[PDB]
Amino acid sequence: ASQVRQNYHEDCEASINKQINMELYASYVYLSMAYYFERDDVALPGFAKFFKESSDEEREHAQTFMKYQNKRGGRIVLQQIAAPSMQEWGTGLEALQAALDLEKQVNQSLLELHSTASGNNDPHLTKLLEDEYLEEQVDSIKKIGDMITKLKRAGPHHGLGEYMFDKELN
Amino acid sequence: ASQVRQNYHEDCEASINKQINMELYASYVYLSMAYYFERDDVALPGFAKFFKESSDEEREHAQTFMKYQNKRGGRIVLQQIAAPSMQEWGTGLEALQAALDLEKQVNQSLLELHSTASGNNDPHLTKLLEDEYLEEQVDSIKKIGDMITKLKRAGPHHGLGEYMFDKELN
Amino acid sequence: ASQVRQNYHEDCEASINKQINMELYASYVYLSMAYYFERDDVALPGFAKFFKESSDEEREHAQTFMKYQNKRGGRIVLQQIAAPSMQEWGTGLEALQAALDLEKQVNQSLLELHSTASGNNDPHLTKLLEDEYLEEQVDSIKKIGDMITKLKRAGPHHGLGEYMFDKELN
Amino acid sequence: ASQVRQNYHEDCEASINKQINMELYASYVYLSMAYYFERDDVALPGFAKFFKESSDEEREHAQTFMKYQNKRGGRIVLQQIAAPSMQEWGTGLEALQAALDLEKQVNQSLLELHSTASGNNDPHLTKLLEDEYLEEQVDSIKKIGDMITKLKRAGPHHGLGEYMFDKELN
Ligand SMILES: [Fe+3]
Ligand SMILES: [Fe+3]
Ligand SMILES: [Fe+3]
Ligand SMILES: [Fe+3]
Ligand code: NI
Ligand code: NI
Ligand code: NI
Ligand code: NI
């Protein structure tokens, strides 16, 4: 085994590899949304910028797990990254609602990761998940929830409301 | 009695203690409104900021009466602060209308304080009430009145008008 | 339920609402002490400044729980804030000893909050309590303990010792 | 009569002339105290500085009434300034207690001036007394009261307490 490995269970190492793929996939989904909103027949530059940032952050999130894997002495195994579930995302509200549910799906995965780490008495992994992932995930879900509510107030259907709300995201 | 006390009637000292509690209560009401508007299903950041500032100011107003009480040689007596009348405040217009009526209720109390001070020939207390409270109260009522009118013009019902008007408060 | 709510148990949401009230109450107690020490017949400006800062911090502590409640999708319920247990606090030592016991009462409540969060497998809430409350609480108790010891050394009874020790707090 | 005089009653003009003399007298008393505390066998430089400032302020207070007299069209009449009641003032506490009672004697005179102005429907004179005299007088009495309390705590009798308290006034 690795000269550095200590108190690092095989199940946590495997779950990290799965979470790496999930972060890469979320990054890919947000990249799809980002350039969907730059289409000449969608033209929502604020939504495009918002999802491009989210795509970059999820790719950073995946790399933090990869660095973590190496730091604990595990071995990174990369799988294929699935095509995004959709290729057209509808209106801003429908993309936000899809993002909201993706984020809660990732949050579920992270809490199950924490349960695995807690069950194998790995306080270093539980600290990583609390400090770097579960905190950011709850804030993202709250931010998206706020945005959904604001967009519903401004007018969620392809109209002046969506046009004005898009400026708030720029 | 206090070595500093002079021309300070027991009725004014008692009315100040009542006004302290009323200011603390108004502060609590505005704190309730402030974090009501930060709910993921309300998401009016401008209203939230407006009421958070008002909550801070009313707590400052209470402390100015407490300093005043001590300066005149009276004794501060603190009572319980009642729960806010409501826990959900509806739309922006309904919160502003509730704030407008709270502010005029506080103004009434202050004018009655002035009548007590004037009836006991306390020009120092009448000067405090005119310079530090009655001036600020009239300006607050005018500001809130302006806002109510502006929000009714922009569209008071959970729509684009309320969304845009909220940006003016940010 | 809230679009953002996830892994947030009803018992934690209710305990947070109770802790909000306790923080508001501690803030009120420290406000009472603060302006007690600005009385013309007490005149301990250092103690007054120390308790005024503590009052501000406890009000900030309550707002962090309110933001937290909203972030997790719970609903803030505000109750009345009880009058402070006393209206006169004696000497500096007696106020510090009262503060010490209030702080350990709040610490007990927070550790029980952590037990509730830990029993419902809420690592996000346990992280909040460890990072933002239990750390600050232990440091506050140590600081107050140091001060009590220093004041007993300098001379705790209404004398030169209390007068000099008060300058250290300014 | 004066080309500028308007709504200025003879009783207010006469009472202002009396208050001018009282301010000049208080200034003289504080000058006596100031150089009493610079005696080689008293040597309280902090008390000396405190009373020298108070002497300067009371002389400024007298000149503000003189400017006021001229502004309203009255005529300044200056009387003799009595010798200070004492020539030796004892300890710091005894000088502060004498100052406290002089300040409340001046405050009484000012409130009676306000009653004269209010009885003759002179809102300009009542504004002067509230804004420039009654406000400063209450703050001075509170400050002196605080100092008396602090000096009694530190030790009012010719000892280390008075020596240390004197440094706070420097
Ligand atoms: Fe992520
Ligand atoms: Fe107010
Ligand atoms: Fe706290
Ligand atoms: Fe004066
Ligand atoms: Ni639609
Ligand atoms: Ni409506
Ligand atoms: Ni004692
Ligand atoms: Ni003596």
XYZ file of C-alpha atoms and ligand atoms in Angstrom:
688
model
C 0.000 0.000 0.000
C 0.901 3.677 -0.186
C 3.606 4.852 2.233
C 1.243 7.687 3.230
C -1.969 5.705 3.670
C -3.372 5.590 7.190
C -6.948 5.102 8.424
C -8.229 5.338 4.851
C -10.868 2.694 4.190
C -11.333 1.131 0.752
C -15.016 2.135 0.760
C -14.196 5.806 1.247
C -11.563 5.651 -1.492
C -14.141 4.115 -3.827
C -16.879 6.580 -2.890
C -14.512 9.498 -3.548
C -13.874 8.120 -7.022
C -17.632 8.045 -7.588
C -18.021 11.594 -6.285
C -15.256 12.790 -8.626
C -17.283 11.543 -11.590
C -20.454 13.156 -10.267
C -18.700 16.527 -9.935
C -17.292 16.217 -13.468
C -20.804 15.378 -14.669
C -22.391 18.376 -12.920
C -19.669 20.530 -14.473
C -20.591 19.145 -17.897
C -24.296 19.810 -17.314
C -23.599 23.439 -16.399
C -21.377 23.810 -19.462
C -24.302 22.589 -21.609
C -26.653 25.122 -19.995
C -24.056 27.895 -20.320
C -23.729 27.657 -24.085
C -27.430 26.903 -24.515
C -28.112 30.391 -23.188
C -25.634 31.917 -25.671
C -27.683 30.688 -28.634
C -28.909 33.443 -30.936
C -32.518 32.323 -30.278
C -32.152 32.197 -26.454
C -29.783 35.132 -25.743
C -29.815 35.212 -21.938
C -26.261 36.422 -21.190
C -26.834 36.541 -17.423
C -27.943 32.904 -17.234
C -25.048 31.949 -19.509
C -22.529 33.637 -17.184
C -24.140 32.091 -14.092
C -23.956 28.548 -15.438
C -20.446 29.002 -16.854
C -19.209 29.975 -13.391
C -21.022 26.980 -11.885
C -19.413 24.699 -14.468
C -15.958 26.022 -13.543
C -16.642 25.560 -9.842
C -17.802 21.957 -10.226
C -14.639 21.162 -12.171
C -12.678 22.708 -9.301
C -14.725 20.589 -6.881
C -13.747 17.437 -8.772
C -10.040 18.382 -8.640
C -10.246 18.948 -4.870
C -11.438 15.348 -4.477
C -8.633 14.200 -6.784
C -6.057 16.072 -4.684
C -7.733 14.600 -1.618
C -7.562 11.060 -3.010
C -3.822 11.473 -3.611
C -3.233 13.098 -0.213
C -4.766 10.106 1.613
C -2.929 7.567 -0.560
C -5.917 6.346 -2.547
C -5.833 5.914 -6.314
C -7.901 8.069 -8.678
C -9.987 6.035 -11.134
C -11.696 8.115 -13.806
C -14.795 6.839 -15.597
C -16.601 8.213 -18.616
C -18.634 11.386 -18.086
C -22.209 10.910 -19.230
C -23.768 13.233 -21.779
C -25.979 15.822 -20.053
C -29.524 14.572 -19.492
C -30.837 17.235 -21.883
C -29.370 19.340 -24.684
C -31.963 22.137 -24.556
C -32.966 23.525 -21.190
C -36.076 25.567 -21.896
C -36.478 28.857 -20.082
C -34.369 30.288 -17.292
C -36.792 28.931 -14.707
C -36.591 25.410 -16.126
C -32.789 25.502 -16.140
C -32.752 26.786 -12.542
C -35.200 24.092 -11.486
C -33.016 21.475 -13.167
C -29.953 22.965 -11.454
C -31.758 22.975 -8.089
C -32.513 19.260 -8.408
C -29.011 18.415 -9.626
C -27.567 20.279 -6.609
C -29.811 18.387 -4.189
C -28.832 15.130 -5.897
C -25.150 15.997 -5.350
C -25.910 17.021 -1.745
C -27.540 13.610 -1.126
C -24.441 11.898 -2.491
C -22.215 14.017 -0.242
C -24.229 13.254 2.896
C -23.998 9.549 2.041
C -20.238 10.037 1.610
C -20.197 11.580 5.085
C -22.088 8.575 6.464
C -19.515 6.245 4.892
C -16.670 8.338 6.348
C -18.374 8.538 9.738
C -19.045 4.781 9.771
C -15.376 4.042 9.128
C -14.243 6.541 11.812
C -12.443 8.823 9.344
C -12.552 12.295 10.960
C -10.228 13.720 8.341
C -12.687 12.830 5.561
C -15.685 14.051 7.540
C -13.877 17.376 8.048
C -13.210 17.720 4.307
C -16.859 17.029 3.454
C -18.181 19.461 6.068
C -15.692 22.247 5.388
C -15.392 22.099 1.594
C -18.531 20.502 0.214
C -21.575 20.397 2.477
C -21.199 24.080 3.394
C -20.915 25.204 -0.233
C -23.731 22.876 -1.308
C -26.301 24.305 1.141
C -25.398 27.867 0.129
C -25.750 26.975 -3.567
C -29.177 25.414 -2.975
C -30.295 28.486 -1.014
C -28.981 30.795 -3.756
C -30.755 28.829 -6.482
C -33.933 28.733 -4.393
C -33.792 32.521 -3.984
C -33.310 32.918 -7.741
C -36.256 30.657 -8.581
C -38.461 32.698 -6.239
C -37.195 35.987 -7.699
C -37.737 34.790 -11.253
C -41.262 33.606 -10.442
C -41.967 37.044 -8.947
C -40.511 38.920 -11.925
C -42.332 36.680 -14.402
C -40.957 33.254 -15.287
C -42.374 32.969 -18.801
C -40.410 34.210 -21.832
C -41.235 37.889 -21.176
C -40.050 41.214 -19.766
C -39.641 39.617 -16.323
C -37.147 37.048 -17.578
C -35.370 39.751 -19.577
C -34.958 41.991 -16.503
C -34.087 39.136 -14.160
C -31.347 38.101 -16.602
C -29.709 41.517 -16.061
C -29.414 40.783 -12.314
C -27.246 37.755 -13.186
C -24.849 39.674 -15.461
C -32.233 60.416 45.342
C -29.528 60.653 42.697
C -26.873 63.332 43.267
C -27.492 64.467 39.670
C -31.292 64.516 39.668
C -32.900 67.918 39.211
C -36.308 68.885 37.795
C -36.900 65.284 36.724
C -40.448 64.208 37.528
C -41.306 60.609 38.418
C -43.897 60.502 35.617
C -41.333 61.401 32.971
C -38.904 58.820 34.350
C -41.649 56.195 34.158
C -42.772 57.211 30.671
C -39.175 56.989 29.421
C -38.999 53.439 30.737
C -42.159 52.648 28.779
C -40.766 54.275 25.640
C -37.560 52.232 25.966
C -39.622 49.043 25.789
C -41.597 50.333 22.814
C -38.383 51.103 20.909
C -36.990 47.646 21.727
C -40.277 46.162 20.510
C -40.231 48.107 17.226
C -36.641 46.940 16.762
C -37.794 43.345 17.261
C -40.639 43.773 14.766
C -38.246 45.086 12.113
C -35.857 42.212 12.812
C -38.749 39.785 12.180
C -39.579 41.504 8.877
C -35.897 41.612 7.889
C -35.359 37.867 8.061
C -38.839 37.147 6.714
C -37.727 38.774 3.473
C -34.578 36.607 3.360
C -36.649 33.420 3.155
C -36.008 31.337 0.050
C -39.715 31.666 -0.880
C -39.864 35.474 -0.374
C -36.397 36.613 -1.563
C -36.774 40.399 -1.443
C -33.211 41.471 -0.542
C -34.021 45.191 -0.744
C -36.882 44.950 1.756
C -34.699 42.764 3.977
C -31.924 45.391 4.008
C -34.414 48.213 4.629
C -35.973 46.532 7.653
C -32.621 45.377 9.052
C -31.421 48.987 9.072
C -34.677 50.076 10.726
C -34.244 47.377 13.370
C -30.724 48.631 14.132
C -31.925 52.221 14.360
C -34.752 51.411 16.774
C -32.293 49.585 19.018
C -30.119 52.705 18.904
C -33.208 54.776 19.742
C -33.836 52.641 22.826
C -30.220 53.085 23.998
C -30.485 56.873 23.613
C -33.418 56.833 26.049
C -31.408 54.592 28.383
C -28.466 57.016 28.278
C -30.969 59.816 28.801
C -32.534 58.088 31.812
C -29.092 57.754 33.412
C -28.092 61.325 32.533
C -31.143 62.749 34.351
C -30.694 60.445 37.355
C -33.657 58.173 36.698
C -33.424 54.393 36.905
C -33.803 52.139 33.858
C -36.380 49.374 34.341
C -36.462 46.827 31.531
C -39.567 44.739 30.871
C -40.065 41.771 28.588
C -40.179 42.496 24.855
C -43.334 41.102 23.301
C -43.176 38.711 20.371
C -43.868 40.555 17.102
C -47.579 40.778 16.310
C -47.051 38.593 13.232
C -44.421 36.108 12.077
C -45.164 36.362 8.343
C -45.631 39.786 6.818
C -47.122 39.106 3.404
C -45.927 41.214 0.504
C -43.681 44.252 0.561
C -46.706 46.541 0.565
C -48.233 44.792 3.574
C -44.967 45.010 5.511
C -44.634 48.715 4.638
C -48.223 49.349 5.678
C -47.572 47.546 8.959
C -44.377 49.577 9.414
C -46.245 52.815 8.630
C -48.795 52.081 11.356
C -46.149 50.992 13.863
C -44.263 54.260 13.213
C -47.400 56.343 13.755
C -48.100 54.378 16.939
C -44.588 55.224 18.185
C -45.066 58.863 17.111
C -48.294 59.040 19.167
C -46.427 57.696 22.184
C -43.667 60.272 21.693
C -46.092 63.195 21.440
C -47.748 61.988 24.652
C -44.267 61.829 26.208
C -43.782 65.438 25.111
C -47.096 66.396 26.727
C -45.978 64.752 29.977
C -42.626 66.575 29.793
C -44.310 69.863 28.903
C -46.848 69.480 31.728
C -44.064 68.982 34.264
C -42.074 71.965 32.894
C -39.104 69.848 31.784
C -37.545 71.794 28.875
C -34.565 69.473 28.759
C -36.825 66.478 28.060
C -38.925 68.389 25.544
C -35.708 69.333 23.716
C -34.580 65.691 23.576
C -37.939 64.560 22.181
C -38.055 67.322 19.564
C -34.421 67.072 18.488
C -33.855 63.306 18.568
C -37.204 61.591 18.181
C -40.067 63.650 16.779
C -37.915 64.951 13.910
C -36.715 61.478 12.915
C -40.204 60.012 13.334
C -41.882 62.436 10.895
C -39.150 61.841 8.304
C -39.534 58.059 8.674
C -43.312 58.289 8.210
C -42.852 60.479 5.123
C -40.250 58.064 3.718
C -42.499 55.055 4.294
C -45.452 56.934 2.804
C -43.393 57.727 -0.305
C -42.391 54.064 -0.588
C -45.980 52.831 -0.281
C -47.018 55.231 -3.051
C -44.076 54.185 -5.243
C -44.795 50.503 -4.708
C -48.480 50.982 -5.531
C -47.431 52.770 -8.733
C -44.912 50.085 -9.710
C -47.370 47.294 -8.912
C -47.908 46.153 -5.333
C -48.894 42.551 -6.031
C -46.272 39.780 -6.204
C -45.112 40.752 -9.720
C -42.515 42.555 -11.830
C -43.359 45.838 -10.075
C -42.464 44.482 -6.647
C -39.341 42.871 -8.101
C -38.137 46.172 -9.612
C -39.134 48.265 -6.608
C -37.108 45.897 -4.412
C -33.990 46.873 -6.405
C -34.509 50.539 -5.425
C -34.170 49.497 -1.761
C -30.904 47.570 -2.237
C -42.069 21.968 2.308
C -39.351 24.416 1.314
C -37.760 23.839 -2.104
C -34.361 24.080 -0.372
C -35.014 21.826 2.617
C -32.955 18.648 2.771
C -31.883 16.525 5.754
C -33.244 19.158 8.136
C -35.147 17.537 10.989
C -38.109 19.244 12.660
C -36.420 18.905 16.067
C -33.339 20.800 14.926
C -35.502 23.513 13.368
C -37.377 23.851 16.660
C -34.225 23.839 18.786
C -32.718 26.588 16.612
C -35.802 28.699 17.247
C -35.282 28.183 20.976
C -31.597 29.070 20.708
C -32.472 32.267 18.818
C -34.565 33.399 21.783
C -31.812 32.494 24.236
C -29.276 34.570 22.284
C -31.692 37.520 22.153
C -32.188 37.132 25.906
C -28.444 37.063 26.648
C -28.112 40.171 24.481
C -30.814 41.858 26.569
C -29.101 40.869 29.823
C -25.804 42.373 28.658
C -27.606 45.538 27.566
C -29.044 45.822 31.103
C -25.575 45.410 32.635
C -24.068 47.870 30.142
C -26.294 50.780 31.102
C -26.275 49.786 34.771
C -22.559 50.548 34.774
C -23.169 53.973 33.183
C -25.240 55.109 36.167
C -23.884 58.181 37.933
C -23.622 56.146 41.174
C -21.826 53.154 39.562
C -19.596 54.835 36.930
C -17.547 51.877 35.689
C -16.993 52.842 32.026
C -14.806 49.804 31.304
C -17.441 47.325 32.490
C -20.082 49.284 30.577
C -18.074 49.025 27.337
C -17.365 45.321 27.910
C -21.021 44.421 28.385
C -22.200 46.652 25.528
C -19.890 44.778 23.155
C -21.150 41.454 24.529
C -24.742 42.590 24.004
C -23.978 43.456 20.369
C -22.278 40.113 19.806
C -25.170 38.092 21.229
C -27.571 39.947 18.946
C -25.267 39.043 16.056
C -25.277 35.438 17.296
C -29.078 35.382 17.183
C -29.095 36.719 13.597
C -26.626 34.021 12.504
C -29.105 31.383 13.698
C -31.900 33.235 11.891
C -29.871 33.272 8.661
C -29.100 29.614 9.300
C -32.774 28.749 9.804
C -33.617 30.370 6.459
C -30.654 28.759 4.682
C -31.811 25.253 5.685
C -35.454 25.976 4.823
C -36.793 26.118 8.367
C -39.123 28.860 9.567
C -38.096 31.435 12.179
C -40.557 31.706 15.075
C -39.835 34.570 17.456
C -41.091 34.499 21.042
C -41.107 37.212 23.669
C -37.749 38.093 25.227
C -37.902 37.850 29.000
C -36.950 40.791 31.185
C -33.411 40.356 32.545
C -33.321 38.340 35.765
C -32.066 41.408 37.647
C -32.131 45.164 37.081
C -29.160 46.011 39.321
C -26.037 43.902 39.065
C -24.000 44.852 42.112
C -20.259 45.188 41.700
C -18.125 44.318 38.706
C -17.336 40.923 40.201
C -21.014 40.095 40.684
C -21.832 41.088 37.105
C -18.918 38.992 35.799
C -20.015 36.037 37.903
C -23.548 36.414 36.556
C -22.147 36.657 33.018
C -19.973 33.572 33.596
C -23.017 31.536 34.622
C -25.161 32.873 31.779
C -22.398 31.907 29.311
C -22.176 28.381 30.723
C -25.969 28.122 30.554
C -25.830 29.083 26.858
C -22.940 26.639 26.315
C -25.045 23.822 27.835
C -27.882 24.685 25.469
C -25.492 24.659 22.506
C -24.021 21.263 23.399
C -27.566 19.895 23.676
C -28.264 21.432 20.253
C -25.201 19.579 18.970
C -26.517 16.330 20.460
C -29.848 16.878 18.694
C -28.034 17.612 15.413
C -25.713 14.640 15.876
C -28.629 12.323 16.709
C -30.426 13.309 13.511
C -27.242 12.888 11.410
C -27.065 16.562 10.409
C -23.346 17.229 9.777
C -24.074 20.666 8.382
C -25.676 21.749 11.672
C -22.946 20.149 13.766
C -20.369 22.074 11.707
C -22.183 25.376 12.306
C -22.344 24.765 16.063
C -18.679 23.759 16.300
C -17.320 26.480 14.027
C -19.481 29.457 15.016
C -20.779 28.872 18.521
C -18.982 26.285 20.637
C -15.564 27.741 19.771
C -16.589 31.301 20.648
C -18.405 30.141 23.788
C -15.360 28.394 25.310
C -13.166 31.427 24.596
C -15.736 33.746 26.209
C -15.914 31.558 29.326
C -12.109 31.479 29.552
C -11.940 35.267 29.097
C -14.558 35.866 31.786
C -12.812 33.390 34.087
C -9.518 35.247 33.604
C -11.253 38.547 34.379
C -12.862 37.207 37.559
C -9.454 35.979 38.740
C -7.801 39.301 37.849
C -10.504 41.289 39.610
C -10.236 39.118 42.725
C -6.469 39.714 42.696
C -6.810 43.477 42.212
C -9.514 43.713 44.877
C -13.111 42.807 44.071
C -14.839 45.065 46.591
C -15.849 48.635 45.682
C -12.290 49.999 46.032
C -9.099 51.060 44.260
C -8.722 47.546 42.818
C -12.067 47.690 41.034
C -11.295 51.228 39.874
C -7.955 50.177 38.336
C -9.289 46.930 36.897
C -12.046 48.936 35.191
C -9.338 50.845 33.276
C -8.066 47.551 31.791
C -11.513 47.055 30.212
C -11.674 50.519 28.605
C -35.670 101.508 21.734
C -33.213 99.493 19.667
C -33.955 99.290 15.930
C -33.513 95.505 16.223
C -35.597 94.865 19.336
C -38.702 92.748 18.840
C -40.607 90.522 21.283
C -37.872 91.006 23.880
C -39.368 91.604 27.315
C -37.643 93.790 29.908
C -37.726 90.922 32.426
C -35.820 88.601 30.110
C -33.268 91.322 29.371
C -32.781 91.823 33.109
C -32.576 88.105 33.871
C -29.925 87.671 31.163
C -27.865 90.383 32.827
C -28.137 88.464 36.096
C -27.166 85.203 34.403
C -24.116 86.885 32.844
C -22.863 87.750 36.327
C -23.540 84.232 37.584
C -21.518 82.731 34.719
C -18.649 85.157 35.383
C -18.820 84.173 39.055
C -18.739 80.429 38.316
C -15.762 81.097 36.046
C -14.026 82.884 38.925
C -14.765 80.019 41.323
C -13.245 77.488 38.921
C -10.204 79.722 38.453
C -9.744 79.724 42.254
C -9.965 75.917 42.365
C -7.621 75.590 39.375
C -4.721 77.425 40.976
C -5.487 75.968 44.402
C -4.623 72.571 42.953
C -1.321 73.905 41.558
C -0.062 74.744 45.051
C 3.149 72.971 46.022
C 1.325 71.402 49.009
C -1.710 70.206 46.975
C -0.132 69.225 43.616
C -3.103 67.658 41.826
C -2.349 68.582 38.187
C -5.364 66.686 36.828
C -7.837 68.549 39.042
C -6.074 71.811 38.192
C -6.475 71.171 34.446
C -10.115 70.118 34.877
C -11.086 73.271 36.750
C -9.068 75.553 34.459
C -11.019 74.227 31.474
C -14.286 74.707 33.376
C -13.284 78.281 34.208
C -12.622 78.996 30.521
C -15.945 77.475 29.507
C -17.954 79.509 32.017
C -16.310 82.684 30.738
C -17.325 81.606 27.234
C -20.846 80.968 28.549
C -21.015 84.521 29.896
C -19.901 85.962 26.530
C -22.591 83.962 24.704
C -25.219 85.671 26.873
C -23.559 89.030 26.185
C -23.665 88.381 22.427
C -27.253 87.247 22.892
C -28.188 90.409 24.798
C -26.798 92.535 21.957
C -28.432 90.393 19.260
C -31.901 90.909 20.790
C -31.333 94.638 21.349
C -31.011 94.539 25.126
C -28.267 96.372 26.995
C -25.510 94.558 28.896
C -25.129 95.748 32.496
C -22.106 94.318 34.287
C -21.992 94.116 38.080
C -19.124 93.268 40.387
C -18.057 89.617 40.505
C -18.072 88.316 44.057
C -14.978 86.752 45.577
C -15.230 82.945 45.502
C -17.042 81.542 48.535
C -13.831 79.820 49.652
C -10.120 80.277 48.981
C -9.054 76.724 49.877
C -11.088 73.833 48.548
C -9.896 70.842 50.541
C -9.483 67.557 48.719
C -10.476 66.678 45.181
C -13.750 65.216 46.417
C -14.648 68.391 48.303
C -13.899 70.553 45.264
C -15.990 68.252 43.044
C -18.839 68.324 45.542
C -18.644 72.117 45.628
C -18.579 72.176 41.815
C -21.562 69.796 41.662
C -23.615 72.121 43.865
C -22.514 75.245 41.996
C -23.553 73.581 38.708
C -26.978 72.667 40.089
C -27.353 76.223 41.392
C -26.616 77.543 37.881
C -29.008 74.959 36.391
C -31.784 76.190 38.728
C -31.146 79.751 37.585
C -31.288 78.664 33.938
C -34.580 76.800 34.359
C -36.026 79.904 36.030
C -34.722 81.922 33.064
C -36.564 79.487 30.797
C -39.751 79.979 32.825
C -39.405 83.754 32.439
C -38.823 83.357 28.684
C -41.696 80.891 28.363
C -44.038 83.157 30.352
C -43.299 86.078 28.038
C -43.761 83.912 24.904
C -40.151 84.307 23.743
C -39.421 81.143 21.711
C -36.098 82.513 20.541
C -34.861 82.799 24.140
C -36.252 79.404 25.106
C -34.387 77.898 22.134
C -31.106 79.508 23.227
C -31.490 78.203 26.785
C -32.377 74.678 25.653
C -29.764 74.417 22.910
C -26.793 76.184 24.510
C -27.198 76.027 28.268
C -29.599 73.437 29.656
C -28.105 70.679 27.486
C -24.527 71.467 28.522
C -25.542 71.898 32.167
C -27.108 68.422 32.492
C -24.065 66.813 30.857
C -21.723 68.691 33.219
C -23.720 67.566 36.265
C -23.680 63.961 35.027
C -19.924 64.162 34.368
C -19.234 65.591 37.821
C -21.515 62.985 39.394
C -19.601 60.214 37.607
C -16.309 61.686 38.831
C -17.495 61.901 42.443
C -18.553 58.244 42.291
C -15.248 57.218 40.685
C -13.232 59.145 43.249
C -15.199 57.610 46.123
C -14.501 54.169 44.633
C -10.786 54.852 44.142
C -10.462 56.352 47.623
C -11.515 59.937 48.292
C -9.155 60.689 51.173
C -5.678 62.141 50.554
C -4.197 58.787 49.458
C -3.158 56.562 46.556
C -6.742 56.588 45.244
C -6.801 60.362 44.864
C -3.320 60.263 43.336
C -4.370 57.707 40.691
C -7.735 59.327 40.021
C -5.915 62.619 39.404
C -4.053 60.936 36.515
C -7.395 60.162 34.811
C -8.083 63.923 34.691
C -4.730 64.850 33.109
Fe -19.784 20.466 -6.374
Fe -37.605 54.970 17.193
Fe -23.936 33.731 21.896
Fe -22.230 77.902 32.364
Ni -42.978 28.590 -19.552
Ni -51.620 41.331 -2.687
Ni -18.689 43.030 47.657
Ni -11.227 63.743 53.720
